[PDB]
Design a protein around this nucleic acid. Structure first.
Ligand code: MG
Ligand code: MG
Ligand code: MG
Length: 115
RNA sequence: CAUUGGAGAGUUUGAUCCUGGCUCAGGACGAACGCUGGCGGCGUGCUUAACACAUGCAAGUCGAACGGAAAGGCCC
């Protein structure tokens, strides 16, 4: 599973397997998947629609894919961050991020009911 | 107590991974060249020889400072 805060990455990450470093940052809605071919394919399959991904280190497709994979695995969903810190999401995480999560969920509700 | 923002590709090997250079996709210009060329709007136009320059023009004005009267102008 990949934690998406409304069609985008939860928080910036930097993953690296072997030598394939991949940097990921969340982006505002409508930004798209600004990523290289392999990392872009990984993100598009994961369902991220607004992300900025850069490929540092080697450009080998397999290693870049593994680096994108563990960069995504390093993602830490806000509820589990709160569980980690023994606090609440309203106490640990940015209000804008939480709000955007509510509007994403509600727009999701709209889509579901419309089905 | 969130962001307005980051894409790669080819090429060392029989094959692989890494390192690594080289090359390319983008944008730009006070540009030139080739082919081509309808119009309008707004800009811009010797980057080199601070090289040598024909010709015209680019700094005059004041008679309410002055003697005046060479012209035009009035009066004989
Ligand atoms: Mg390394
Ligand atoms: Mg060799
Ligand atoms: Mg070969």
């Amino acid at each position: 599973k990949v934690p998406l805060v409304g069609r985008t990455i939860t928080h910036p990450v930097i993953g690296e397997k072997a030598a394939g470093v991949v940097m990921l940052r969340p982006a505002s809605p409508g930004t798209g998947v600004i990523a290289g071919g392999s990392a872009r394919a990984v993100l598009e399959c994961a369902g991220v629609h607004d992300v900025l991904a850069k490929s540092l280190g080697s450009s080998n497709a397999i290693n870049v894919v593994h680096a994108t994979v563990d960069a995504l695995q390093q993602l830490e969903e806000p509820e589990e961050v709160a569980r980690r810190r023994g606090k609440s999401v309203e106490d640990i995480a940015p209000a804008a991020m939480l709000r955007a999560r509510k509007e994403a969920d509600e727009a999701a509700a709209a889509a579901r009911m419309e089905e």
